Amino acid sequence: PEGPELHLASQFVNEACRALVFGGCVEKSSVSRNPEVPFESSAYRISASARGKELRLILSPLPGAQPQQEPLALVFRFGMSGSFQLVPREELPRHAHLRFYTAPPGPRLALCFVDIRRFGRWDLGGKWQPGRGPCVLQEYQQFRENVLRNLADKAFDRPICEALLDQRFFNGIGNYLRAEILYRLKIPPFEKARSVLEALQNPDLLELCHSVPKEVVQLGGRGYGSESGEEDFAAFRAWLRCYGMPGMSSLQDRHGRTIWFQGDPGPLAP
DNA sequence: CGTCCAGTCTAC
DNA sequence: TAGACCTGGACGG
């Protein structure tokens, strides 16, 4: 998942947990190489926020919840399959690697981090990854400045399609958004990144880095996702103009990732 | 049955 | 850089 999916997953946790109270421990699957969450409360609320391709849960005990516990923050990266679901406690999906359990009164639910391929990670401590740039969705001006002020970096020597995956400058952009953004401006994907960015130093490339992903969020649904039904998933495939679409070209970048585009591949093409 | 395809992370 | 980390669906024989 990319920035829109991290964002929608955060909105899901906030809306679906608004009136839920969790209790007990935070349970990790035995196969998961991620750390155990040292947290226990008779009564805590779960809330979320997204920044780029990371999501932060806050575990907030209620007044007088036992054991005495301070709020705990967990930050998640989703890799290729990460996901959050609210399921009935005894109908855990396969690959539910981390689980928060509702307290009574009510139907016993589990909020689960579900990750088929286990590329996802969480760290104890609530901090965003050092080095990740501002969120293209929620910190646009900070995102735009962090790019324009550092065009000297060797990161911008590379093809624009490669630079757009560097989470130090485009936190929240992944393989589908880089195709959709470049297609909107018909920028050849193997144009040099510094060449296309220097001008800014009729929406430009950095505006689209915000507004294109915002469109996926505004579809509602769960972006490149089905944790909302088939309706929302087909809604997303219909929004796509370029990623995977018939009559589009594709090449491998230097990291073996597929870039979709129309027309001129650009000068630094392999 | 088999191949091929779908975001970091780190050891060369 | 390239291979590693994973599972599963879509396809081909």
β-pairing, A54-61 vs A72-77, is antiparallel
User: Residues A79, A114: one domain?
Assistant: yes
User: Residues A27, A99: one domain?
Assistant: yes
Residue A251 falls within a domain, yes or no?
Answer: yes
Residues, CB < 7 Å to strand B: A 1-2, 53, 77-80, 117, 119, 121, 129, 165, 167, 174-176, 250, 255, 257-258
Residue A269 falls within a domain, yes or no?
Answer: no
Residue written as token pair 């230097």:
A254
Residue A224 falls within a domain, yes or no?
Answer: yes
User: Residues A77, A119: one domain?
Assistant: yes
What domain count does chain A have? 2
Please report, for residues A159, A160, A192, the alpha-carbon distance to residue A267 in angstroms, rounded to integers and kept in the order given.
9, 11, 8
A84: Cβ contacts below 8 Å, ≥ 6 apart: A9, A12, A13, A55, A111, A112, A113, A114, A227
Q: Are A98 and A32 in contact (CB under 8 A)?
A: yes
Residue A268 falls within a domain, yes or no?
Answer: no
Catalytic center residues of A: 1-2, 53
User: Residues A109, A187: one domain?
Assistant: no
User: Residues A125, A146: one domain?
Assistant: no
On the CB side of A235, how many CA atoms lie within 13 Å of its CA? 18
Q: Are A176 and A183 in contact (CB under 8 A)?
A: no
User: Residues A126, A137: one domain?
Assistant: no
One-letter amino acid identity for A4? P
User: Residues A179, A88: one domain?
Assistant: no
Q: Which residue is nearest to nucleotide C6 (CA to C1')?
A: A117
Of A80, A101, A132, at which residue does a domain stop?
A132
* Coil vs helix vs strand at A186: coil
User: Residues A143, A220: one domain?
Assistant: yes
The range of the structural domain enclosing residue A199 comes to 133-262
Determination technique for this entry: X-ray
Q: Which residue is nearest to nucleotide C8 (CA to C1')?
A: A116
